[PDB]
Amino acid sequence: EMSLIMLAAGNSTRFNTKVKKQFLRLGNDPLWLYATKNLSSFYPFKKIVVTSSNITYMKKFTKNYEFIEGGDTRAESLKKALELIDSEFVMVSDVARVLVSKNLFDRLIENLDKADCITPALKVADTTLFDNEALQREKIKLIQTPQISKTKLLKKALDQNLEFTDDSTAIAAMGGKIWFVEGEENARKLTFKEDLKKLDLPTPSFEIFTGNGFDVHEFGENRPLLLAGVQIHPTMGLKAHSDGDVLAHSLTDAILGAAGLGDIGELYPDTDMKFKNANSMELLKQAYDKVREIGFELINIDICVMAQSPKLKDFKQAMQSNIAHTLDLDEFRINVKATTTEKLGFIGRKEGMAVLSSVNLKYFDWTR
Amino acid sequence: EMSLIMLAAGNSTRFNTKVKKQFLRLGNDPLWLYATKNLSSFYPFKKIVVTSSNITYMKKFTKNYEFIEGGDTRAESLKKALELIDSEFVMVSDVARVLVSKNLFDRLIENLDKADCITPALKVADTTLFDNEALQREKIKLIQTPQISKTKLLKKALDQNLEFTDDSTAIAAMGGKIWFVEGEENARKLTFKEDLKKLDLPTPSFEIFTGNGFDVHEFGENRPLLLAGVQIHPTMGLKAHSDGDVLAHSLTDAILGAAGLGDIGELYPDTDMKFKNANSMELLKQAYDKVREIGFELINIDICVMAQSPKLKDFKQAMQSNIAHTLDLDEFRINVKATTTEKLGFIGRKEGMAVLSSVNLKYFDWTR
Amino acid sequence: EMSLIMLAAGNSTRFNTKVKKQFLRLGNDPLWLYATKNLSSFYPFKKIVVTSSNITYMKKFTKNYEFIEGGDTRAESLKKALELIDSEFVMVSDVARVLVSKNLFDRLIENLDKADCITPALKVADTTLFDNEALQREKIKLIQTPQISKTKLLKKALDQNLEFTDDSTAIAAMGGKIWFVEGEENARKLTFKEDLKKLDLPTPSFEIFTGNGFDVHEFGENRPLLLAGVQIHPTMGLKAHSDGDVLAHSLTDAILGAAGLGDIGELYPDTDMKFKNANSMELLKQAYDKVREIGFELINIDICVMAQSPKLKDFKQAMQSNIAHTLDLDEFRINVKATTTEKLGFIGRKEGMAVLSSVNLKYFDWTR
Amino acid sequence: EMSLIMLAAGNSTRFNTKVKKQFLRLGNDPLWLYATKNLSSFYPFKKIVVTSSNITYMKKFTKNYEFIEGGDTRAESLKKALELIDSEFVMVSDVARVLVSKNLFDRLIENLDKADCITPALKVADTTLFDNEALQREKIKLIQTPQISKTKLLKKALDQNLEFTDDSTAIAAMGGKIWFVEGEENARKLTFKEDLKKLDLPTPSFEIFTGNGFDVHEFGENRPLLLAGVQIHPTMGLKAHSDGDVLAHSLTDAILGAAGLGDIGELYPDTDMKFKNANSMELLKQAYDKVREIGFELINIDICVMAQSPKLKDFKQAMQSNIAHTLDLDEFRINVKATTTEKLGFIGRKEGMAVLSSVNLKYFDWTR
Numbered sequence A, B, C, D: 001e002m003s004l005i006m007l008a009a010g011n012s013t014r015f016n017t018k019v020k021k022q023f024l025r026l027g028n029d030p031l032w033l034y035a036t037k038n039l040s041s042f043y044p045f046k047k048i049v050v051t052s053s054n055i056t057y058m059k060k061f062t063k064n065y066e067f068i069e070g071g072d073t074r075a076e077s078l079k080k081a082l083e084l085i086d087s088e089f090v091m092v093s094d095v096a097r098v099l100v101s102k103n104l105f106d107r108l109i110e111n112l113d114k115a116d117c118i119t120p121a122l123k124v125a126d127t128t129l130f131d132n133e134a135l136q137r138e139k140i141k142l143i144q145t146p147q148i149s150k151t152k153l154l155k156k157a158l159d160q161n162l163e164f165t166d167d168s169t170a171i172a173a174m175g176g177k178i179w180f181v182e183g184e185e186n187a188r189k190l191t192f193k194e195d196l197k198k199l200d201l202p203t204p205s206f207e208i209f210t211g212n213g214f215d216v217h218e219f220g221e222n223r224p225l226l227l228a229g230v231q232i233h234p235t236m237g238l239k240a241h242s243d244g245d246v247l248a249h250s251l252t253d254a255i256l257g258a259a260g261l262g263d264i265g266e267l268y269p270d271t272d273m274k275f276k277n278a279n280s281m282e283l284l285k286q287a288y289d290k291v292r293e294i295g296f297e298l299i300n301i302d303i304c305v306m307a308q309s310p311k312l313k314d315f316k317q318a319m320q321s322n323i324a325h326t327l328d329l330d331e332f333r334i335n336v337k338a339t340t341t342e343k344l345g346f347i348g349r350k351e352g353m354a355v356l357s358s359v360n361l362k363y364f365d366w367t368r
């Protein structure tokens, strides 16, 4: 009997960009789940645990695994996770190590009894420099994952010290015995931008996601009217909680809703007002930065500004242009339309204005 | 002179799932039309007739063929269809037999005069058991399609008896003579889930379909407020015709509209009220079940609830969660936003509430 | 030192259809930019100039190149463009010549000094007929592109005469010396429909574009009510500026907005009224004709007609059918829903009606 | 009723190298037969005639076609060939035009009655120069093949004049009417080295051919002993008919025998002695030049020199080296062994010496 831990928590700008690597799309599945799915196919684990910096989101993708909140470091994470494990044995692995082959798994498990922790390793044939200083290459081992370990010893191995980079050194530094099985190129750890092209990773699925956004604001506030952060009119201002950009909030909602990241108020509520100031376009940027973190990319934006006045004709290239700049996309993907309601309803009576945004999101093309 | 009948009517849960197999997408075309297109390329038929359990829908896909309503059985269907045929000869084929090669067609037609009905057949080299009891394998024939038959004889062959599974046995059981041309693996009949991977079928096109949905309901009804079938508030009910779920009807429309299946009222009208009760979420399920039958699958849902009150914040994970369950999709594909209209208009005055749904549908990935 | 001119202006129905060929999608990039990108990768040009019949649109795709308005002919265009060039040398090329290989470029530039203009050429081994009359095939040269020319001489070569088809004959007809480097099949000029399948062109990207459309019209005009150009009711007309088709204008906006071509008023404004008459469905056709010109194609239309009356039930197949005909798409891609607002708001009070359109556009599949 | 002529005669160093292009291997078949096979699949021709500069060789490849000896020119060839044709119609084609598609054939034959000769043609979109001088490109036609012609008129069309490059101009120059069907890129004429990579030609089959060679010469001739044209010994000469190189003749036979080109005496007989002089290595070169002409290339040579004396040890790198140079191959492909017969038999008694050559030939890799 043996359980599995997938360590998928933390986050750092090594690989990273604006997009977390556990959230890269390989097929329909995000990396973290792709990896967990792959390992989980190999063996009936008594329990599967996944460490996370994003439990609530992660959870919306499956019901199969127990999720435990990550720690400050890999070991910290792993300790926390082990406390949920009662099987005699445990197999721990990095999600970043996506394409671990069944072959290698069989090699690990066929040596289950020889020592206290079992590990893939590879030799090094190149001149190795530790700090611009030569090292005897034959004595080097590159250590991979998964690693199978006796639960009881691993829990104890991490009672005090939490600086260990892998299970093997942890078990080792407590007197335990280590068994080195030959590793493989498929077990590489996705750490740098450059690594992506070095792995036979499935390119992301072609699904496109839609989002809508609707927002209303009351007229009659003596300040400038800002839409997509372009100044439309010096006094015909909107009675808002921020700088009053109905366009920008409408669009924000649409971008969020497409990513299943709620709506604008779940992020930037009217109750707390460090948002009193609020440059809405910046709030929009930040909204998109969240969508980008979970592996999404805007295809296009279509906006429809419902307002009886003022005539937004002259300002429409300026609005499209500013969105493009803020959200960092080519100008052609942005389109701002406008319409009166022919004097009908609150919009037509001039009580306020509304904006209707429409968006499509694709999964980030990580093939550069 | 020779006409063509494509038998594409009926329906049964042999292959089936929630999706009719004539509606599977192979390229841009649904199976039934893909198959009819393929056969129709091979020969200038005087008339092409397609039997259907879905004329009105089927018709929206071409203007080339005459459609006749199907019968209770294959023969029943075929009789009905022959009554539209005046050419001396007729070629009948199952749509389910998609990839019939030009080669085999040439073999059929090059033997047009030798007998009364001409048919593909294959021998069997395996031990064959009729009812767990061995049968002399050499005496067996697996009969395929198309089959060319002399119209006059086929019409007569089906005057009384309608139990016949293919044209050959029908012509045969009336004294007529049958000619067996060698069949092929491409002429296989798509009957079971498992068959799909046994055929070199073109994978479905990557087109995504959009849908919008808008619905309004009046406030002031002393009962609970249900949205996506989650109870929001015990008394602030909506004045509806059913349980009053504006969300669920708005979403229903969007799912229907994306599939070109009309709107909610074309299915579930306010006139007839066996819908007086009406659990709207179940009506939604049923709506989706129609969309699924014609080869579609939801990518994502984005909903925007326009309501001045109550504050739906606390209930948004519960709404998303319930939709996911009802429509049987992963939770991450559902997003429910909400907005007041800042006291403006009927929504803002609290007269009623509106919901705006946005959806994308992809063609069903039948590669499992 | 050497600058680059990409000639991408003009337009004619040689290749053409309803779609301009510089706007065909090869990867994410339109042809003109794909081609300019390819050449621009080969050498650090001091200045890159692109000639255009569409500057404003073209500009929304990059910030890298200087765009100058095209002339009536290729030479006219080229003269205009040279006036922006101060480098000693210039390389001119047709955008239509998309896949020009690095190899051939190296051949051009490695012969930079031998003469006044350097050009790819190919021999002809077939019987050649000039006007059904045989010509000595060995004496023929098919002239390609790019061509490198000494700026000063090319400017002068086009001072008077502007009938020249390529740089070489222009330089030649002024006494200058021409150097013929062997051309290639990749440097072919995309001129006819048939040429597409003769080039290894990257198929278009799979991105889908969304568009929304909203339009309102006031009731109480004694004439017929036209929606999608189907007559709904003989007297319950809308107070419009044209024939009053709210559906058709709503849809027009959506189709435009998806293509980033603004909104309906940017095309067909209420100020000028040669649109007084206005058959809106024809205006819609024309709108789509613009979207088609820039490489887009409708996947589907979903429309939601907000109107308290009249009951549009009986007319919904007729509306879908008429749109299909006007926009020239299969009937199944069109869906018209309708909803009252349960007597609430201006719509529900019967003051006017609104329509909400939703659309998805894909890039034109030029593989036929 | 219609017959086919494949013109495969003549030869020139346009494409050519050391290898005739009708003899290039595409699959197992040489080009000429590959092409004839392709056209012959398309239609039951009453008679198939192939013109040849190599009847006797050509004949060893099939029994299906009538072969007639070629003329000095293409027309000369074609006249000669027509005299074997009695069908009303004839289709003539260049073998060099290998991959003519069924599609295009159907286009030719579906216009069989409209005029006197029917021909594929393509337009030209490039600037065309006739003798460095511009020509109105729209008036140009590139003429392809096949061409269908009325036999009677074609025979007459070539009664006097034989300078015509294709059937169309010949029929035309006699008043007959010409019909131009659109041609294709697959109908290109393989004329230049460079053309090969422009056609989707099947790469040659992987068959290897073996050859053996045995030759004996009597000792006791007061001159130098030459083997592979290296001087072995100043006086121990062989009593030959030429310079006496037993090695070189043995190897010649082996190279010929592998190519089914007979033996050395069929080329260079002892009766005629302009071979009295005879530098055998040059005769060997020439032998290989024949093998090269019919599409073959040496993989390796293994030679075994049976001689009781002299000891050839010191001269074996020099022999291998000289063969390599003569036959123009890398040195590693040549190996010369030697053996006495331990004083037994004529060899061992020193009456003469024998040489046994072994060779493998592959088909020329025309992919450069």
Ligand SMILES: Nc1ccn([C@@H]2O[C@H](COP(=O)(O)O)[C@@H](O)[C@H]2O)c(=O)n1
Pocket: A006, A007, A008, A009, A010, A011, A051, A052, A070, A071, A072, A073, A074, A075, A077, A093, A094, A095, A096, A097
């Ligand atoms: N605090 C941390 C740090 C890393 N990890 C995971 O451990 C694996 C290996 O860690 P590093 O990539 O940081 O070396 C990664 O897949 C990462 O997601 C974790 O679960 N908790």
Ligand SMILES: Nc1ccn([C@@H]2O[C@H](COP(=O)(O)O)[C@@H](O)[C@H]2O)c(=O)n1
Pocket: A263, A264, A265, A266, A270, B306, B307, B308, B309, B310, B311, B312, B313, B314, B337, B338, B339, B340, B341, B342
């Ligand atoms: N009925 C409503 C209206 C608004 N809200 C929330 O309040 C936020 C701010 O709403 P307004 O912009 O309409 O003031 C929204 O983003 C939404 O999260 C809600 O939860 N229920």
Ligand SMILES: Nc1ccn([C@@H]2O[C@H](COP(=O)(O)O)[C@@H](O)[C@H]2O)c(=O)n1
Pocket: B006, B007, B008, B009, B010, B011, B051, B052, B070, B071, B072, B073, B074, B075, B077, B093, B094, B095, B096, B097
């Ligand atoms: N009542 C029926 C039953 C079957 N059929 C068609 O006949 C073909 C063969 O029938 P079975 O698959 O039911 O044997 C199928 O393509 C099916 O669509 C029909 O047109 N009408």
Ligand SMILES: Nc1ccn([C@@H]2O[C@H](COP(=O)(O)O)[C@@H](O)[C@H]2O)c(=O)n1
Pocket: B263, B264, B265, B266, B270, C306, C307, C308, C309, C310, C311, C312, C313, C314, C337, C338, C339, C340, C341, C342
């Ligand atoms: N103007 C209208 C309004 C509604 N309807 C139909 O009536 C149905 C119910 O509409 P309400 O939900 O607006 O009462 C809709 O689904 C639509 O089919 C219509 O056909 N014409």
Ligand SMILES: Nc1ccn([C@@H]2O[C@H](COP(=O)(O)O)[C@@H](O)[C@H]2O)c(=O)n1
Pocket: C006, C007, C008, C009, C010, C011, C051, C052, C070, C071, C072, C073, C074, C075, C077, C093, C094, C095, C096, C097
């Ligand atoms: N007036 C014109 C005509 C053609 N051109 C460009 O010159 C190139 C070659 O011209 P033609 O295709 O018209 O021969 C094309 O890529 C076309 O876009 C231009 O830039 N201005």
Ligand SMILES: Nc1ccn([C@@H]2O[C@H](COP(=O)(O)O)[C@@H](O)[C@H]2O)c(=O)n1
Pocket: A306, A307, A308, A309, A310, A311, A312, A313, A314, A337, A338, A339, A340, A341, A342, C263, C264, C265, C266, C270
């Ligand atoms: N506030 C507004 C309202 C309308 N417009 C423009 O006026 C045009 C006609 O608007 P109506 O249909 O609302 O009269 C729209 O297409 C839009 O270009 C605008 O520029 N600013």
Ligand SMILES: Nc1ccn([C@@H]2O[C@H](COP(=O)(O)O)[C@@H](O)[C@H]2O)c(=O)n1
Pocket: D006, D007, D008, D009, D010, D011, D051, D052, D070, D071, D072, D073, D074, D075, D077, D093, D094, D095, D096, D097
């Ligand atoms: N004397 C000749 C010259 C050419 N030909 C054939 O005619 C075809 C076209 O001729 P050219 O390639 O010489 O133009 C070639 O396939 C060539 O083999 C012939 O059969 N007799």
Ligand SMILES: Nc1ccn([C@@H]2O[C@H](COP(=O)(O)O)[C@@H](O)[C@H]2O)c(=O)n1
Pocket: D306, D307, D308, D309, D310, D311, D312, D313, D314, D337, D338, D339, D340, D341, D342
């Ligand atoms: N004429 C000869 C005969 C033999 N030899 C060499 O002497 C070796 C032994 O030859 P026997 O086996 O014929 O005695 C051969 O392998 C060959 O290298 C030679 O170099 N010249």
Ligand SMILES: CC(C)=CCC/C(C)=C/COP(=O)(O)OP(=O)(O)O
Pocket: A344, A345, A346, A347, B214, B344, B345, B346, B347, B356, C341, C344, C345, C346, C347, C354, C356
């Ligand atoms: C698709 C969408 C969101 C359409 C909005 C159009 C609409 C129903 C306006 C209501 O009018 P109103 O509330 O301003 O009328 P009044 O305030 O006079 O009652």
Ligand SMILES: [Zn+2]
Pocket: A215, A216, A217, A245, A246, A249
């Ligand atoms: Zn707001």
Ligand SMILES: [Zn+2]
Pocket: B215, B216, B217, B245, B246, B249
């Ligand atoms: Zn409702």
Ligand SMILES: [Zn+2]
Pocket: C215, C216, C217, C245, C246, C249
């Ligand atoms: Zn309008």
Ligand SMILES: [Zn+2]
Pocket: D215, D216, D217, D245, D246, D249
């Ligand atoms: Zn000899």
